Design a protein that fits this description.
Chains A, B: Its main location: cytoplasm. The structure is a homodimer of 574-residue chains. With 574 residues, chain A is of the alpha+beta class. Chain A has helices spanning 49-52, 59-63, 89-102, 117-126, 146-150, 159-175, 184-195, 198-202, 211-216, 219-225, 232-237, 240-243, 261-271, 306-320; strands spanning 5-14, 20-28, 34-41, 67-72, 106-112, 114-115, 133-135, 138-139, 250-257, 277-285, 292-293, 296-297, 334-338, 343-347, 356-363, 376-378, 386-392, 427-430, 438-452, 458-466, 472-481, 500-513, 518-524, 552-558, 565-571. Chains A and B meet through strand 1 and helix 2 of A and strand 1 and helix 2 of B. The structure holds (4S,5S)-4,5-BIS(mercaptomethyl)-1,3-dioxolan-2-ol (DBC) (2 copies) and chloride ion (16 copies).
Chain lengths: 574, 574
């Protein structure tokens, strides 16, 4: 019967090592084999409502004749084995895909879909070389776990993401263990305390001493905290360099305020030349898909469009798993939610063709410290040789407000920055009030000429849309940890007092700065707990006590010989 | 096979009039008949992810051997007939329950669960007299549609709820019609415009002229706007007076910032003496179950506890549908999220036994206008005979901020009231800063001595928790429309200048006002668009042009002969 299906729970699938993973099979009433979609989930395959609202109304797929397999990853819930993030997912996906392809009900065409960890696992599956995998659809995901979500392109630890997620999984690890333990109740209370106060959890020094999380999930220290360089342990689990050799269609979703945004977009660029890639980017953060934030509303159109997403996924799978050549007729290659105008818009590529990468130079009379300073932005090089100076004290870092926060207040991406504008270590540079709109859509970066009293420190840059009423709304930001200025792999310290030209990767955005607005840039040396705080010592940061850390006198140089600037991806549409 | 199930889509169930309703059947792999749960849904039975996250992980029920039936209500999606809210749901539920009980796979025990409209329909089912219905679980619902969500106990129209919901259904009505229409695209745009700007939509005068909504859903005017009195049209669809004669177990869920809170709680009180009633109340609004708000966070424990809810529902249904006498061992009768302390707490009853209904009298030297006025609250009667006076202008009503908003900014219940504190028509009365905690848990009301220059007007009262940092956080509020001061059914006008003692029903709350806080009350004559604005004419409000309306000079009298006060449900726990 068309539209009818059955569900078989806890079908045990043997991996190459004999460890069995549990899957649930959603199989249509059909007369022969069918195309199959696989989802790999560390958050209980039974708990479909937890993630599905951030994805697709995928029961539509089943009603339309696809089978769907949802799997508990190794060591969690109904699966056997031991759980360690990332390290088993390439092999376990390969073995699972192989098992699916062998089944009576599989017609030889398999795809995947899902969000976050259910997205990362799709890249890990895609590098398997399993020919039967015809398409993937990774949403809010990464193919390089160092670059997102654990560290970043600037070489700072994404500490709130790490501690929040580890506490989240810690709840899952206890819930899914064999027998209940006397310490479980107290552990459950302590994990809740972390999730209620992620900045507090991240504030403990040495950062690497995590009695609870290190016990429940040793990986938090053994892999993440202990490996600050993008070293061999990270390279092992990275998929990114293998993406170029694939020819697997990928339907990629991202969010402008999502922790994974930079890495999600990079995956699109990596696969677009060799297969049918599609891109959808909305104004969402990882846990807020509503389009509504405390000081910024994007409109109901911005709410994660789950039925349109479902329709697009089905068309995509119809094309690539069912060989329906015209299934994607009228579907755009790229669909972006352009903020400011607050409208969806179709594009032919990402980056946009006809992106003008335009320097906006830091300038101004007098100090740029605070929002009431004299800092300017201009497409013209600054005429006078100046410098702005501030003290960065690790005991008092600049608090994270919006941006791509994941677990610490991660539901307010476009956050008003005014609460930090009176700080002396927040340097502000803005354009005059705009008389005509300026669209900035693409990857964003800064090139700063900097010096420090320290042998290591951080520099941050944050793009901001200043509204007529004074709201200073965050758009996108990045960090550079100075030891990693030239490489994430082989860091070196800097010489105190020497001027360096450094790049800050500020991920990406799409925003029209409307008439009456200003373009604003904030520069500092911290953004905590989005990123951990530099100790300004050159030491092993995560092993240092707060008292061991040093203050740094940091300086931004600006003028004709040191033309510090932000590079804006300008789009002009007449 | 235990834990396995099948799904049959679009099974057509004939009603008494021959009109067939579409249902989906989720039926366990079992050897005989099973207990059955029914959900009646106007938002597409296929779209389970849309509502389920506000309810239960109900696939657990199916894995555990319950069948679940989800039905499209009459005239929507796959169902035949014509849709009109409420009017067909008693009969259609009776006929559906009867059909279920006749099926080979039903063991004679049926229950229901679900939220909002999926909750209201359970009360409509419960009055059917169908013996096979053994238990219901209505969440965020009402048994009196006048009192919630369309009007209220004060006799003002809940205009934002009406217009927002009508636009929401209007999307559904177009989506589920026979053939696509040329006007659909433009209609879809206009509906989005309403949902993006509900206060704007509610601001049009006459309010009753609704070209779009009146065309798509004539009921919006024909029933709701046209019937401001709690008349026979409303009585017809009310279930409340029939609740006392039932003996049906009900698991009732409510939220402190939910539009239905007053009516949800009243249903518990109505059924508790005759059957096993249970109550769960969290700090949620209708569309925000997260525990997180712009200026108030309740902690992760406050996040809608969906797996605990699932466990409780299963225990409840095990007791009442499966006759498992000990299934509810250790389950509390009442479980409340007590704000301030921000903790869940078990109780034996609602209202709490040992509630001290305590008057807090309005007082103070000089005018109470604005937060910087002299208004006080005290358990002692005020010594001097005073009055506070203000102009209420319908062209400039007090904006709604938080509270029990549904569609207009309905995601910020505990909203900071400071943005309206400089208004001359907002009278503020507060206690001194508290040195010891004061718990207020229960139903809340005000008794005010009032006068007006007009023959009709409104008075509002809003309970507020003032935090050390100045945040003035809304707790619960109500309104009285003066023509309905003595009855919602047979209104009469007032005499200009005469003093009336009126009651304002302020719904309910649970809050510990902690040391360093103040208890605050705001009094005014508007709260728009939570409630429509009184025209101050005595006329048919929804038919008046703004220009036809009048300003009113309104007065609150306070002192020994006019002891205006709020009645707080004080709980003392030592
Ligand atoms: C997704 O499920 O949420 C996490 C946010 S850090 C991420 C871990 S790879 O996956
Ligand atoms: C629920 O589904 O949302 C509506 C809010 S007004 C309500 C109508 S009875 O049901
Ligand atoms: Cl089988
Ligand atoms: Cl293992
Ligand atoms: Cl262990
Ligand atoms: Cl806005
Ligand atoms: Cl749009
Ligand atoms: Cl372009
Ligand atoms: Cl100097
Ligand atoms: Cl130089
Ligand atoms: Cl059958
Ligand atoms: Cl009909
Ligand atoms: Cl029609
Ligand atoms: Cl708070
Ligand atoms: Cl609690
Ligand atoms: Cl009590
Ligand atoms: Cl007078
Ligand atoms: Cl009198």
């Amino acid at each position: 019967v068309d539209g009818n299906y059955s569900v078989a729970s806890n079908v045990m699938v043997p991996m190459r090592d004999g460890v069995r993973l549990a899957v649930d099979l959603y199989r249509p009433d059909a007369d022969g084999p069918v195309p199959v979609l696989l989802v790999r989930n560390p958050y209980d395959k039974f708990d479909v409502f937890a993630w599905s609202t951030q994805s697709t109304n995928w029961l539509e797929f089943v009603r339309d004749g696809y089978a769907v397999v949802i799997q508990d990853t190794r060591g969690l819930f109904a699966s056997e084995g031991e759980f360690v993030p990332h390290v088993d997912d390439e092999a376990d996906a390969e073995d699972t895909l192989s098992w699916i392809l062998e089944q009576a009900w599989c017609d030889g065409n398999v795809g995947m879909f899902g969000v976050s960890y259910l997205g990362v696992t799709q890249w890990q599956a895609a590098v398997s070389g399993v020919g039967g995998l015809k398409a993937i659809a990774p949403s809010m995901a990464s193919a390089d776990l160092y670059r997102a979500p654990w560290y970043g392109p600037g070489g700072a630890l994404s500490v709130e993401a790490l501690l929040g997620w580890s506490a989240k999984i810690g709840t899952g690890l206890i819930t899914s263990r064999s027998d209940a333990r006397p310490e479980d109740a107290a552990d459950f209370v302590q994990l809740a305390a972390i999730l209620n106060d992620v900045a507090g959890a991240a504030s403990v020094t040495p950062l690497a001493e995590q009695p609870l999380l290190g016990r429940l999930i040793p990986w938090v220290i053994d892999q993440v905290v202990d490996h600050p360089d993008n070293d061999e342990s990270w390279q092992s689990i990275s998929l990114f360099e293998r993406l170029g050799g694939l020819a697997t269609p990928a339907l990629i979703t991202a969010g402008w305020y999502d922790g994974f945004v930079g890495e999600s977009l990079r995956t699109f660029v990596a696969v677009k030349d060799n297969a049918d890639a599609r891109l959808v980017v909305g104004p969402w953060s990882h846990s807020n898909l509503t389009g509504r934030n405390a000081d910024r509303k994007f409109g109901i159109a911005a709410t994660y469009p789950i039925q349109e997403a479902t329709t697009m996924h089905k068309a995509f799978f119809d094309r690539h798993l069912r060989g329906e050549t015209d299934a994607l007729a009228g579907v755009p290659k790229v669909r972006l939610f352009v903020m400011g105008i607050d409208e969806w818009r179709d594009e032919t590529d990402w980056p946009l063709p006809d992106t003008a990468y335009t320097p906006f130079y830091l300038g101004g009379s007098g100090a740029a410290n605070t929002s009431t300073g004299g800092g300017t932005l201009s497409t013209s090089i600054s005429g006078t040789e100046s410098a702005d100076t501030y003290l960065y004290d690790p005991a008092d870092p600049v608090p994270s407000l919006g941006g791509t926060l994941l677990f610490h207040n991660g539901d307010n991406g476009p956050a008003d920055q005014r609460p930090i504008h009176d700080r002396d270590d927040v340097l502000c540079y803005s354009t005059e009030v705009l008389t005509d709109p300026v669209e900035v859509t693409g990857t964003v970066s800064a090139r700063l000429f900097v010096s420090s009293s320290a042998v290591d420190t951080d520099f941050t840059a944050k793009l901001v849309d200043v509204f007529p009423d004074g709201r200073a709304i965050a758009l996108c930001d990045g960090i550079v940890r100075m030891r990693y200025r030239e490489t994430l792999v082989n860091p070196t310290l800097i010489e105190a007092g020497e001027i360096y030209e450094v790049a800050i990767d500020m991920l990406a955005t799409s925003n029209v700065f409307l008439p009456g607005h200003r373009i604003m840039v904030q520069v500092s040396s911290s953004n905590f707990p989005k990123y951990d705080r530099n100790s300004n010592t050159g030491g092993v940061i995560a092993r240092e006590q707060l008292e061991e850390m040093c203050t740094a006198v940091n300086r931004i140089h600006r003028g004709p010989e040191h033309p510090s600037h932000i590079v804006l991806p300008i789009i002009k549409r007449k």
